[PDB]
Design a protein around this nucleic acid. Structure first.
Ligand SMILES: CN(CC[C@H](N)CC(=O)N[C@H]1C=C[C@H](n2ccc(N)nc2=O)O[C@@H]1C(=O)O)C(=N)N
Ligand SMILES: [Mg+2]
Ligand SMILES: [Mg+2]
Ligand SMILES: [Mg+2]
Ligand SMILES: [Mg+2]
Ligand SMILES: [Mg+2]
Ligand SMILES: [Mg+2]
Ligand SMILES: [Mg+2]
Ligand SMILES: [Mg+2]
Ligand SMILES: [Mg+2]
Ligand SMILES: [Mg+2]
Ligand SMILES: [Mg+2]
Ligand SMILES: [Mg+2]
Ligand SMILES: [Mg+2]
Ligand SMILES: [Mg+2]
Ligand SMILES: [Mg+2]
Ligand SMILES: [Mg+2]
Ligand SMILES: [Mg+2]
Ligand SMILES: [Mg+2]
Ligand SMILES: [Mg+2]
Ligand SMILES: [Mg+2]
Ligand SMILES: [Mg+2]
Ligand SMILES: [Mg+2]
Ligand SMILES: [Mg+2]
Ligand SMILES: [Mg+2]
Ligand SMILES: [Mg+2]
Ligand SMILES: [Mg+2]
Ligand SMILES: [Mg+2]
Ligand SMILES: [Mg+2]
Ligand SMILES: [Mg+2]
Ligand SMILES: [Mg+2]
Ligand SMILES: [Mg+2]
Ligand SMILES: [Mg+2]
Ligand SMILES: [Mg+2]
Ligand SMILES: [Mg+2]
Ligand SMILES: [Mg+2]
Ligand SMILES: [Mg+2]
Ligand SMILES: [Mg+2]
Ligand SMILES: [Mg+2]
Ligand SMILES: [Mg+2]
Ligand SMILES: [Mg+2]
Ligand SMILES: [Mg+2]
Ligand SMILES: [Mg+2]
Ligand SMILES: [Mg+2]
Ligand SMILES: [Mg+2]
Ligand SMILES: [Mg+2]
Ligand SMILES: [Mg+2]
Ligand SMILES: [Mg+2]
Ligand SMILES: [Mg+2]
Ligand SMILES: [Mg+2]
Ligand SMILES: [Mg+2]
Ligand SMILES: [Mg+2]
Lengths: 60, 110, 206, 55
RNA sequence: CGCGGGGUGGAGCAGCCUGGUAGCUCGUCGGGCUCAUAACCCGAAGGUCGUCGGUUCAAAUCCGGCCCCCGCAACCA
RNA sequence: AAAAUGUAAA
RNA sequence: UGGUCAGCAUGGCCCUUACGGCCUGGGCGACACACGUGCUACAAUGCCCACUACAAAGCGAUGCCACCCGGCAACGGGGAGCUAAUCGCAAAAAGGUGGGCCCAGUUCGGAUUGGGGUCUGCAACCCGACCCCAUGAAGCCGGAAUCGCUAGUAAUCGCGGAUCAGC
RNA sequence: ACGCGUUAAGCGCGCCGCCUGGGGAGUACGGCCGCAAGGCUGAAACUCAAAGGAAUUGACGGGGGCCCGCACAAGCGGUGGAGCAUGUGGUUUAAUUCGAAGCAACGCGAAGAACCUUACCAGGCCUUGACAUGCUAGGGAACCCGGGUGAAAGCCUGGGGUGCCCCGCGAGGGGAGCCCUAGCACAGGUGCUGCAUGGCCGUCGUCAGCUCGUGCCGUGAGGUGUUGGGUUAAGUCCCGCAACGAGCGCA
């Protein structure tokens, strides 16, 4: 079971709790920022490529 | 269709095969494989004796078994049990093979 | 693996973003989710023309979408046609104005994801594997650059113990920031697995 | 003569007496061995009951 | 059967004489060091004392019957 | 002066 | 032959009213044990109490919620100001200052527990978090062993986001 | 190859001794010698696909020299000891989902496990399915709606409708979506395999190193450069230098 559970988060099944944040590319229930709707790794790889606007290497 | 022990009570020995340390190591591996057929079910199993293993487990072992079903659910394995593992006794990180002997001892008049 | 990503190393340093726009809070999500999806057909369809790079931007709603390619005669279709049924298919899930200004790519020997896609399906379609790494870095070196590098991981020739192998020549300093570097990546599905191809054309300081 | 053959760096079992290469190693090495214990006691129909059915 | 000595934590030994008084070594389980095992370092766990009566306030200890380990005998002229 | 050992598969 | 087929991708193998798919209880939180990371203490260089001062960051129109009043309270109903160098979370705590303790398993310590409440979310037996009563436990400084750190760094203070209905 | 080199291991002639794969084994049998201890002479069965010599590059050293890092020393607080929180082993269980394994696994994947998350258990339901391509076939339209029914899923079952397409005056052509089904390949799987792989990261390690080109040196593996003296955070330069340049590195 991992495909059925993909759509199950999207369509709010029965309550205002069973609407967990999935990622959009990979689909992971962990580390999912609500800013990007993205897991930390989909966030990772799309960050380095340039495909995430305005984001660059942090350093201070 | 004639026999008394279609489903009787039995003892069970396990000895060191090849693999040396992963002989005593794997014999102890299958120990818990049989030991968890006991009080995850019903059975009362003492070890009658067991010579130790230098890097773990035991070479020689033997277990007096309780509960009916040691000869309807254990009878069919008085032989060898070769295993192919990467032993937790390796210098580098290569694969090896080992083996062990088992003995289902029934119940003489006593 | 441990090495740094060369492009991320130069966001706002030597190379600009593949997509660019400012965005309000709860709008950013599905604004990028479109960006990625927008390239969905772009990555898919245009590959046949050597999809060099996508370049999305979004004004006040309006999204211009310039697309670079090696030979655009593919991109246009029968006159105004495939280039139109681009915008047709575009705004049909976009909803924003899809004003695309299709770019060009002068030399395909100096674009790395171009060298990547080509080398990659050179083994997909099965060829001499090392030669095609050497030839690649060859007619790409003399073909405009000052330095160049490309690698193949995974089962070369389909051996069980998957080797890596590469070719390289001329000052290619991934450590040095001032260097213009094109990170060309290309997956390569084959009968026996999946091959990894990374490309490195160094076009100069800046 | 090896009754059964295991393989954790492969995850498998193989009782050289049935044909039972059918495997699961993990939760069988855990001790839940009623998986292999059954078809081998079911291999006594073609054995002893087939001996007493015609010859 | 006759005398002599013996039987105590798993192994081996003290403890009995002079009662209340359970120690030494190993090992064993818990922990440390070590890549790991031994070594070694830190802790703990473990005997109603052969067996039975019985003396005393009370028995490893005193006493007697029986079981057992061991030692000399049972001279057959 | 300290201080043992590492079975058997590229 | 480090890690990951369980993020995703992926060659091969296997399942095909079932290894696939839905719900609901339950589960990943079980307890003779053992270990690692941490928290808070054992106090007098302190704990308690009101006045009281002083940072940066960082977040908030799915919300951040002043202020009124209800309330021991958590919070509650009311309601203002912000697209936010406007206003909001906001009293920064160590501190300064007054007081109070008085060498005790204590005013140190807050574990554990009985009944009584607020908040989320359908939902609080497993199972949350806060609140009030009360309970007031081990611990008087740590065996063998063992860790970080060479300067605004160790040590010691509060605040903050991300996950998130809540935690 | 090492090294030999008028003291030959060079160039020659003469004469003797000796070798013919390793083990077995300088053993056994015989023979001769010995007071003995033993010596001399000295095989085989069997057995292995090697035994070996010199040299190279590394790694290691309870070898040497020179360096460095909270490595110790010098100092400051700390778990290990207590109670509680969290993660594992283990055990237990109906299941106690999985992976992570010294350094580099153990407040790790988890930046949110009440159901959800959820991959496990347990019992009631799905069969081209929650899911996207597409094929015929019976064909309703959208469906707000509703009960039945149940823990919910579900499976029963109504009350329903005046779409778009056709212009057919036409009470009925199909077309259209979708609803629907049974029903054509399909799906889907967190099922196994990091010892079939990509990608990504940990790690020796910010360690100061590692290599290529041409030349020369060696029959060769290889050497040199890159060694040395000095300096540096450093293969950082400096002087030298059979080497001269160059790339990946520190910069
Ligand atoms: C062995 N001798 C023998 C001694 C006598 N003169 C001879 C002899 O035979 N005497 C023996 C005579 C019998 C004796 N005897 C044996 C059994 C018995 N129940 N009672 C006895 O008297 O034991 C004596 C014994 O052998 O010394 C010596 N060394 N002197
Ligand atoms: Mg019998
Ligand atoms: Mg805008
Ligand atoms: Mg529009
Ligand atoms: Mg051109
Ligand atoms: Mg293609
Ligand atoms: Mg080159
Ligand atoms: Mg492909
Ligand atoms: Mg298990
Ligand atoms: Mg079971
Ligand atoms: Mg006696
Ligand atoms: Mg004894
Ligand atoms: Mg003594
Ligand atoms: Mg006595
Ligand atoms: Mg006494
Ligand atoms: Mg001491
Ligand atoms: Mg006595
Ligand atoms: Mg006698
Ligand atoms: Mg060993
Ligand atoms: Mg081999
Ligand atoms: Mg403390
Ligand atoms: Mg005081
Ligand atoms: Mg005072
Ligand atoms: Mg005190
Ligand atoms: Mg006390
Ligand atoms: Mg001590
Ligand atoms: Mg200390
Ligand atoms: Mg020479
Ligand atoms: Mg001469
Ligand atoms: Mg010679
Ligand atoms: Mg000779
Ligand atoms: Mg020989
Ligand atoms: Mg000789
Ligand atoms: Mg002869
Ligand atoms: Mg002789
Ligand atoms: Mg120095
Ligand atoms: Mg467990
Ligand atoms: Mg597990
Ligand atoms: Mg948490
Ligand atoms: Mg639950
Ligand atoms: Mg009802
Ligand atoms: Mg139905
Ligand atoms: Mg209807
Ligand atoms: Mg009409
Ligand atoms: Mg019409
Ligand atoms: Mg008409
Ligand atoms: Mg008509
Ligand atoms: Mg293989
Ligand atoms: Mg060379
Ligand atoms: Mg060198
Ligand atoms: Mg030097
Ligand atoms: Mg240099």
């Amino acid at each position: 079971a991992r495909k059925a559970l993909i759509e199950k988060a999207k369509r709010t099944p029965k309550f205002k709790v069973r609407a967990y944040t999935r990622c959009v590319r990979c689909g992971r229930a962990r580390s999912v920022y609500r800013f990007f709707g993205l897991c930390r790794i989909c966030l990772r790889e799309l960050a380095h490529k340039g495909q995430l606007p305005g984001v660059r290497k942090a350093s201070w | 269709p004639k026999d008394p022990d279609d489903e009787r009570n039995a003892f069970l020995e396990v000895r060191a095969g090849t693999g040396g340390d992963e002989a005593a190591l794997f014999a102890g591996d299958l120990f818990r494989m049989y030991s968890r057929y006991a009080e995850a079910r019903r059975w009362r199993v003492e070890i009658m004796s067991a010579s130790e293993g230098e890097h773990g487990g035991y070479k020689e072992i033997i277990a007096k078994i309780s509960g009916d079903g040691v000869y309807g659910r254990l009878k069919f394995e008085s032989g060898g049990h070769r295993v192919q593992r990467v032993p937790a006794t390796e210098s580098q990180g290569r694969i090896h093979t080992s083996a062990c002997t088992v003995a289902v001892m029934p119940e003489l008049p006593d | 693996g441990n090495k740094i990503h060369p492009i991320g190393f130069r966001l706002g340093i030597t190379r600009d973003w593949e997509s660019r726009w400012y965005a309000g809070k709860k709008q950013y999500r599905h604004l990028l989710l479109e960006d990625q999806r927008i390239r969905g057909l772009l990555e898919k369809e245009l590959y046949s023309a050597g999809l060099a790079r996508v370049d999305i931007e979004r004004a006040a709603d309006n999204v211009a979408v310039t697309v670079h390619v090696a030979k655009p005669g593919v991109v246009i279709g029968r006159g105004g046609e495939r280039i139109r049924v681009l915008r047709e298919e575009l705004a049909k899930l976009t909803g924003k104005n899809v004003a695309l200004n299709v770019q060009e790519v002068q030399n395909p020997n100096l674009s790395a994801p171009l060298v990547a896609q080509r080398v990659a399906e050179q083994i997909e379609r099965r060829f001499a594997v090392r030669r095609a790494i050497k030839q690649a870095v060859q007619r790409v070196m003399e073909s405009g650059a000052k330095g160049a590098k490309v690698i193949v991981s995974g089962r070369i020739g389909g051996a069980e113990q998957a080797r890596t192998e590469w070719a390289a020549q001329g000052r290619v300093p991934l450590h040095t920031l001032r260097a213009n570097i094109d990170y060309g990546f290309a997956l390569a599905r084959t009968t026996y697995g999946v091959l990894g191809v990374k490309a490195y054309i160094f076009l100069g300081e800046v | 003569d090896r009754n059964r053959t295991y393989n954790f760096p492969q995850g498998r079992v193989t009782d050289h007496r049935i044909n039972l290469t059918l495997y699961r190693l993990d939760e069988v090495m855990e001790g839940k061995l009623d998986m292999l214990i059954e078809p081998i006691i079911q291999e006594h129909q073609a054995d002893q009951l087939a001996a007493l059915s015609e010859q």
